[PDB]
Write an enzyme that holds these catalytic residues in place. Structure first.
Site, PDB file in Angstrom:
ATOM      1  N   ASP C 141      20.482  -8.564  15.817  1.00  6.16           N
ATOM      2  CA  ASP C 141      19.617  -9.665  16.215  1.00  6.16           C
ATOM      3  C   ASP C 141      18.115  -9.295  16.100  1.00  6.16           C
ATOM      4  OD1 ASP C 141      19.166 -12.303  16.995  1.00  6.16           O
ATOM      5  OD2 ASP C 141      20.325 -12.115  18.828  1.00  6.16           O
ATOM      6  N   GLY C 166      17.144   7.216  16.568  1.00  3.89           N
ATOM      7  CA  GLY C 166      17.299   7.877  15.273  1.00  3.89           C
ATOM      8  C   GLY C 166      17.435   9.423  15.498  1.00  3.89           C
ATOM      9  N   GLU C 189      17.965   0.130  25.229  1.00  4.40           N
ATOM     10  CA  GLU C 189      17.752   1.218  24.265  1.00  4.40           C
ATOM     11  C   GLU C 189      18.819   2.303  24.477  1.00  4.40           C
ATOM     12  OE1 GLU C 189      14.989   1.208  22.123  1.00  4.40           O
ATOM     13  OE2 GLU C 189      15.023   3.203  21.210  1.00  4.40           O
TER      14      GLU C 189
END
Ligand SMILES: CC(C)(COP(=O)(O)OP(=O)(O)OC[C@H]1O[C@@H](n2cnc3c(N)ncnc32)[C@H](O)[C@@H]1OP(=O)(O)O)[C@@H](O)C(=O)NCCC(=O)NCCNC(=O)CCC(=O)O
Ligand SMILES: CC(C)(COP(=O)(O)OP(=O)(O)OC[C@H]1O[C@@H](n2cnc3c(N)ncnc32)[C@H](O)[C@@H]1OP(=O)(O)O)[C@@H](O)C(=O)NCCC(=O)NCCNC(=O)CCC(=O)O
Ligand SMILES: CC(C)(COP(=O)(O)OP(=O)(O)OC[C@H]1O[C@@H](n2cnc3c(N)ncnc32)[C@H](O)[C@@H]1OP(=O)(O)O)[C@@H](O)C(=O)NCCC(=O)NCCNC(=O)CCC(=O)O
Ligand SMILES: N[C@@H](CCCCC(=O)O)C(=O)O
Ligand SMILES: N[C@@H](CCCCC(=O)O)C(=O)O
Ligand SMILES: N[C@@H](CCCCC(=O)O)C(=O)O
EC number: 2.3.1.117
Lengths: 274, 274, 274
Positions: C141, C166, C189
């Protein structure tokens, strides 16, 4: 509108069997017309009537159907390519139309066709999805998102990284609504048809959905689904019965005042000139 | 700079009556010059002097005036169009200039003209607004935003979805400042002229504004407006007097250490080569 | 793969001395091959084997090396320009390939080369970084980010403004992994190799890293690094020993149920047709 409402509600029932190839010319032209009206502001998904917001479900249905009737097409970006089925609202505009329309669109702000943008608004880089309605004088700050069918009032300030819930996925009964003159603080999120009543100030990092308790420390009253007009809301927590942990909640700490107004004002100099 | 400072401070007083059409050639050329200097790093909105950050208000004024003197123009995107009045910083650059300038710009990262980007920085897709200054070796990670006039130190890591407050809307007295060697965790926000002192580590989901209490659990001291150098800050809450609820606050849990350093280091291999 | 694995692990040791100019043809062609395989889904950075996720470090090494062997080049945006060294995945695609590949790419969604996107996925405007793998039926999204080397399962819903960690900067041992059928709420997150087990539901504004305590209020058990399959997680706080303050934590409030499922379902009508 009955001539459209009818065809629309008929097809929706057959939604899973319609495809861009088997769809009949009638239904195609209609969904097309309905999307063009939403794009114009002539029609809108939710409206306030007799002081109650009401959802026009048939209009949500048409938004949904557009995804069954249209086929994807390659869209040429400059350094990359895209493949999607909803056209870009501004792709056909020229200076005249932009001048006439009276809003500001900051690159790389993007808006889908079928969304209404009112005069005197400023879109910083952000996203406005199909069926949304953004009213006069509103600013959509950087990386904010106005979800599908969402209703944003006049003079509202959606700060950076703010997200206003859509109705497409997850599928929702009612759109999310932010009334006039509200300020939504950075990185906050309002979803699941929650209503933020006019003149309210939501602080940074506030997350409001149907399961969120909006606690009024003054009265002891706990709200669900709506922010009473003129509230100032901030993040907090409520303690477990045993007091062994606490869980997130939104807290109404006070009513908007001069002090508050000092920090959340709209900057008229940034708006449209003459 | 007095030859510019003067014209500038004169016009600002007449801000509401100036428009792209009635503005005199003098004032236009000047604001233009001032923006070109900010863009160069030759001038900057806030500077540290005698170990105190100071704001050059006349420079904030010129940024503001640029919005009164310039007119919008259609900007051609590939698949869509934009209508705005602040040029794109990199639109005229060629490989030579990029090579000479020494930073990396990841599509679709975007920067407005009037913003300073230093050598050896990496801009992931993000936004840097007019008048901002981003110093050497800094990385601006995905969807982060460096607000108008904000000051970012050297070797800073602004994580994903981070927002650094601007000064345009809402209107602000002082820019937001992040000193050298700081790491700002994902989705955090720093606004309203708060100062994060050098070498500090802000965790994820930390929201700092003038009303935020930065609580030092060690000393019991509560800060407002600034993060003391070398702190590690995380989200927490402070309990009401009755203990019936608690409200958000930032908590300084410790001073940066090897352990911390293990999780927040800059990756030199990603920086500029020779 | 040994013919590649070998050259790769050799160069990595010399990483700091390699540059786009001094790099030998062998090592260049190899890193190139390895990136092309990751891009294909033929190879992937982490894999589940015998019910344990395992990281192929040599593949992380090649991702890293690509930044030492390739030189930046000007990329032409429409209204602006970019200067970077990782090509755009979709720049060479035509309708045939998009049709054949079977996913939807909404402008201005962007994906780097070396990332795998599976059939039947929908990318709203967002970012997918090098080495990532996004499995079937997943939706990314608006403004979400799939970090370098991250592994996203099938039918996952990454809501708006969500960030998945990452491994490049800060440098990380293991990629972040979200298993099949998970729903990650808006602005949350997940970073630092945390694993969210299949069928879990993470609420809005939840921040999970190695130092985050995932507290199970039922059992009293505190997890670190992983979310047990089928959990529903929300933000909360745990009180200090003295009870003078509390700090952030993630709380497992229950196991997914029909009620939960009502709010987080994938919308099949948005997926690929026939
Ligand atoms: C809500 C505020 C305006 C504060 O309300 P106020 O200033 O009128 O009231 P205060 O008197 O300071 O606070 C009243 C009570 O609420 C608490 N409180 C207020 N704001 C709070 C906050 N953010 N966190 C915690 N508590 C807060 C106060 O501590 C005080 O406690 P108490 O009453 O019990 O003693 C402020 O906190 C806030 O949220 N401001 C908006 C910040 C924001 O979103 N700015 C936009 C960023 N600007 C940019 O340019 C970003 C750019 C980008 O990201 O792209
Ligand atoms: C702040 C940390 C580095 C942790 O500090 P540390 O590892 O040096 O210290 P710790 O010993 O683990 O913590 C000290 C105290 O603080 C608490 N604490 C630390 N971090 C905490 C956190 N995030 N939440 C809650 N408590 C935390 C610890 O529980 C501990 O408690 P106590 O001392 O009372 O017993 C970490 O929490 C953090 O915030 N890391 C940064 C995460 C981040 O922003 N990563 C970037 C994401 N990476 C990407 O690639 C994203 C990509 C994208 O989004 O696009
Ligand atoms: C996790 C939820 C699904 C709620 O779980 P549920 O509805 O199955 O369970 P509930 O019975 O309501 O909650 C169980 C307990 O958890 C608490 N709880 C649940 N959700 C909570 C939340 N978000 N905050 C705080 N507490 C919560 C409840 O209060 C309840 O308390 P208790 O059990 O102790 O009495 C919901 O809170 C949630 O997070 N939904 C996802 C929201 C989201 O991310 N939506 C995506 C936004 N949609 C868009 O289109 C955005 C677009 C964009 O941003 O671009
Ligand atoms: N959560 C978002 C998802 C939009 C999907 C749009 C698309 O598939 O094109 C919303 O409900 O608005
Ligand atoms: N909150 C942002 C708004 C920027 C508006 C820029 C514009 O109107 O062009 C800031 O103060 O930087
Ligand atoms: N936090 C991000 C940073 C990516 C940098 C990519 C680049 O320099 O090109 C990650 O680890 O994925």
């Amino acid at each position: 509108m009955q001539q459209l409402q009818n065809v629309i509600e008929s097809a929706f029932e057959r939604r899973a069997d319609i495809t861009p190839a088997n769809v009949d010319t009638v239904t195609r032209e209609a969904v097309n017309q309905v999307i063009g009206l939403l794009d114009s502001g002539a029609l809108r998904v939710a409206e306030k009537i007799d002081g109650q917001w009401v959802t026009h479900q048939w209009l949500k249905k048409a938004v949904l159907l557009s995804f069954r009737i249209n086929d994807n097409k390659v869209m040429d970006g400059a350094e990359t390519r895209y493949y999607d089925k909803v056209p870009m609202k501004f792709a056909d505009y020229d200076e005249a139309r932009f001048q006439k329309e009276g809003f500001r669109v900051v690159p790389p702000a993007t808006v889908r066709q079928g969304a209404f943008i009112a005069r005197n608004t400023v879109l910083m880089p952000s996203y406005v999805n199909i069926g949304a309605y953004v009213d006069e004088g509103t600013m959509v700050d950087t990386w904010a998102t106005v979800g599908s069918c969402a209703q944003i009032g006049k003079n509202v300030h959606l700060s950076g990284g703010v997200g206003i819930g859509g109705v497409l996925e997850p599928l929702q009964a009612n759109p999310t609504i932010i009334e006039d003159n509200c300020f939504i603080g950075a990185r906050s999120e309002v979803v699941e048809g929650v209503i933020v009543e006019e003149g309210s100030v939501i602080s940074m990092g506030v997350y409001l959905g149907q399961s969120t308790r909006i606690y009024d420390r003054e009265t002891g009253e706990i709200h669900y689904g709506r922010v009473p007009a003129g509230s100032v809301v901030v993040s907090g927590n409520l303690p477990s019965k045993d007091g062994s942990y606490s869980l997130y909640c939104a807290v109404i700490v006070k009513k908007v005042d001069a002090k508050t107004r000092g920090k959340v004002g709209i900057n008229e100099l940034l708006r449209t000139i003459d």
